[PDB]
Amino acid sequence: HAPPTLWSRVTKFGSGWGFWVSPTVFITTTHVVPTEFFGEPLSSIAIHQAGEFTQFRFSKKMRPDLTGMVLEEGCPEGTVCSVLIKRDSGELLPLAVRMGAIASMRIQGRLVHGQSGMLLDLGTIPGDCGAPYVHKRNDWVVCGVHAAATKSGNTVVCAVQA
Numbered sequence: 001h002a003p004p005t006l007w008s009r010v011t012k013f014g015s016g017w018g019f020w021v022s023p024t025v026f027i028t029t030t031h032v033v034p035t036e037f038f039g040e041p042l043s044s045i046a047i048h049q050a051g052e053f054t055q056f057r058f059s060k061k062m063r064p065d066l067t068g069m070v071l072e073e074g075c076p077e078g079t080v081c082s083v084l085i086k087r088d089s090g091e092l093l094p095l096a097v098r099m100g101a102i103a104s105m106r107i108q109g110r111l112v113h114g115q116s117g118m119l120l121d122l123g124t125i126p127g128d129c130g131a132p133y134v135h136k137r138n139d140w141v142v143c144g145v146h147a148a149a150t151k152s153g154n155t156v157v158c159a160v161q162a
């Protein structure tokens with residue numbers, strides 16, 4: 001069960017969402033970033049982007065209220081994560097996912113350093129991109145941000161860091 005403080009890391013961002021990993025670190029899917037971030041000129045931030053995974057490091061502490069959590073490069077295969085989806089209506093929609101393997105993918109012409117998974121009635125929509133994939137290890141670990149799903153809904157992909 002994900003607690004409110006965890007949910008509160010999920011933040012409306014561009015055409016999708018992002019996740020406050022720590023008071024200074026925000027992660028999201030590259031193709032939702034618009035073309036200032038939370039009232040910071042672009043020169044303020046350490047932006048690292050690769051494979052549809054964007055990470056922002058801010059200068060000032062943007063979410064002092066959070067404890068920093070562990071950002072892993074994906075998760076061990078087979079693992080079950082929760083996808084912490086917020087809808088524009090405010091509904092919280094935690095989706096459980098059995099994580100397949102990490103792999104380079106080409107999805108609608110973009111290179112995704114991603115990890116696939118199977119759902120476990122509900123599925124992802126456009127607008128859900130950037131929502132975090134998480135599991136608890138006395139910790140909560142974030143291993144990905146939502147990037148794609150198949151025309152169906154069975155399989156979803158999250159972009160992972162390198």
Ligand SMILES: *[C@@H](O)[C@@H]1CCC(=O)NCCCn2cc(nn2)C[C@H](NC(=O)OCc2ccccc2)C(=O)N[C@@H](CC(C)C)C(=O)N1
Nearest residue numbers: 031105107108110124125126127128129147148149150151
């Ligand atoms: C967030 O910006 C979206 C997430 C949309 C989602 O999760 N479900 C929407 C269901 C409708 N739908 C759109 C597509 N598929 N279904 C387009 C595309 N999917 C696809 O090409 O097949 C999946 C796949 C997986 C592995 C290998 C080949 C193909 C898709 O999801 N595109 C992304 C954007 C890309 C990554 C630039 C997308 O729409 N994300």
